[PDB]
Design a protein around this ligand. Structure first.
Ligand code: NA
Length: 509
């Protein structure tokens, strides 16, 4: 049973577990939509009150579980709280990261293919003042890549290039994963993370060199870090912030769990945990935030940039930014560094979220790692044809898995641990082996404040928001829902087969 070779590599694998497209694509959008410093106050408080305490919880659960030879939730949950219903609530730990992995690798597939075309100079050349005559070639460029419908039909038809780049991205994930935890993953994490922070810093610097009549890049800064204290009363903001906090730290993914289960029993989660997190927060609020937004706020001024991120998630990353760059000396290459940064950022993140499914096939169904990975790739590859060819199918999985399910699972796994399993046994399992220890106040966050946050939020969500989604939507949503439900069923059948194999051989041995 594998463990992390070196401590730094651990932290670097854990920081790359958190760090990814969320730092770069996602964060700028959620902050732009939610109005800068109006988003940050919630984001920070959520970080302390939710992200922080939740990460230690997931850490401990992973380590505690790995000690018993179990990396995933369906197993671990049985241990903390003994039930057939503990296993069932644990199937969300396989399900969330799987469904997320489905559309996530595909979006990272985009970054790779763009970086490729952007290097070789296959990008479009805009006409030598007007923003729309500028952004359009790139809008068309992305739309041509992912095959956005020209018709009414909710039907995507990606390019032969995008398709093959996905197969490649899939291969590259396999190649990292098939070498295991220390050899495959921990190596790459040591390479990638510095390789990442360097590319980011360079871009941050190079982006600060932008000025137009419309603004400096220091305009975007003071938009992001200067509060609106009135929006403190707006629930949608608080809902947006925690959605970022979860997604950013890979909370509720059953990710931190699986990785941490390869931590040796004695090893400190209480420092390495905090470190890899504070690394991500750097890659988010410091690096990630200081690139995409300030560039647009510089070119188009604030209000227009804010209007671009509302117009789509991929507007800023895949369209606006490379467009801005093309107005500068060697901007096509500076674009390649953008998408190259993204690929490497998503590659550390994607190998993390495909692991839980792999660790399961290993720890439970007793599959060779080679086999665990191939099938995990096969399932993800196949299932994603839905995301690729069906319009807005991507939106659906993001909502159920990486939006709702993550919060549902976070509160769930906090309850199972800090309540059912009991407070102090958990409080011990955390600080145990710790190089340093969790502040006494954080005991009382984990027990009360944290779940009080998630429960109340999950209310203000369900009551004041959700039904419109479940109602107003086009009927193609039921195709994704159908499938990803049959994924839960499929997974539950494996949890079933696992406990059956357990019952049979344990009676013979
Ligand atoms: Na992130």
């Amino acid at each position: 049973r594998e463990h992390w070779a070196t401590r730094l590599g651990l932290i670097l694998a854990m920081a790359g577990n958190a760090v990814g497209l969320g730092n770069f694509l996602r964060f700028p959008v959620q902050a732009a939509e939610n109005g800068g410093g109006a988003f940050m106050i919630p984001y920070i408080i959520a970080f302390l009150l939710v992200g922080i305490p939740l990460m230690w919880i997931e850490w401990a659960m992973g380590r505690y579980g790995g000690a018993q030879g179990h990396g995933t939730t369906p197993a671990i949950f049985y241990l903390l709280w003994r039930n057939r219903f503990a296993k069932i609530l644990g199937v969300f730990g396989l399900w969330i990261p799987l469904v997320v992995a489905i559309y996530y690798v595909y979006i990272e597939s985009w970054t790779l293919g763009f970086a490729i075309k952007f290097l070789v100079g296959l990008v479009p050349e805009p006409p030598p003042t007007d923003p729309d005559s500028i952004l359009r070639p790139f809008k068309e460029f992305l739309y041509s890549y992912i095959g956005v419908p020209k018709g009414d039909e909710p039907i995507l038809k990606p390019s032969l290039f995008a398709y093959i780049v996905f197969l490649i991205t899939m291969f590259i994930n396999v190649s990292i994963l098939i070498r295991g935890i220390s050899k495959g993953i921990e190596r790459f994490a040591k390479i990638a993370m510095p390789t990442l922070f360097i590319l980011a810093v360079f871009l941050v610097i190079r982006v600060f060199l932008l000025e137009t009549p419309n603004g400096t890049a220091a305009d975007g800064l003071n938009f992001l870090w200067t509060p609106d204290f009135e929006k403190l009363k707006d629930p949608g903001v608080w809902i947006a912030a925690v959605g970022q906090i979860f997604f950013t730290l890979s909370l509720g993914f059953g990710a931190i769990i699986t990785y941490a289960s390869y931590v040796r029993k004695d090893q400190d989660i209480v420092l390495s945990g905090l470190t890899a997190a504070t690394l991500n927060e750097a890659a988010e609020v410091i690096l990630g935030g200081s690139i995409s937004i300030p560039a647009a706020v510089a070119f188009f001024g604030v209000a227009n940039a804010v209007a671009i991120a509302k117009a789509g998630a991929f507007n800023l990353g895949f369209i606006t930014l490379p467009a801005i760059f093309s107005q500068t000396a060697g901007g096509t290459f500076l674009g390649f560094l953008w998408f190259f940064l993204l690929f490497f950022a998503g590659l550390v993140a994607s190998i993390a979220i495909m692991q839980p499914m792999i660790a399961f096939l290993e720890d439970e169904l007793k599959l060779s790692r080679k086999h665990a990975v191939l099938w995990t790739a096969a399932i993800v590859f196949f299932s994603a044809h839905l995301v690729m060819f069906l319009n807005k199918s991507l939106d659906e999985m993001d909502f159920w898995a990486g939006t709702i399910g993550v919060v549902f699972f976070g509160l769930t796994e906090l309850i199972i641990f800090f309540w059912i399993f009991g407070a102090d046994k958990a409080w011990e399992e955390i600080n145990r082996g710790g190089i340093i220890k969790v502040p006494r106040i954080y005991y009382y966050v984990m027990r009360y404040i944290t779940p009080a946050f998630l429960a109340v939020l999950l209310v203000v969500w369900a009551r004041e928001y959700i039904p419109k989604i479940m109602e107003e939507t086009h009927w193609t949503v039921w195709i994704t829902r159908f499938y990803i439900i049959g994924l839960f069923l499929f997974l539950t059948f494996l949890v079933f087969l696992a406990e059956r194999r357990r019952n049979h051989e344990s009676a013979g041995t």
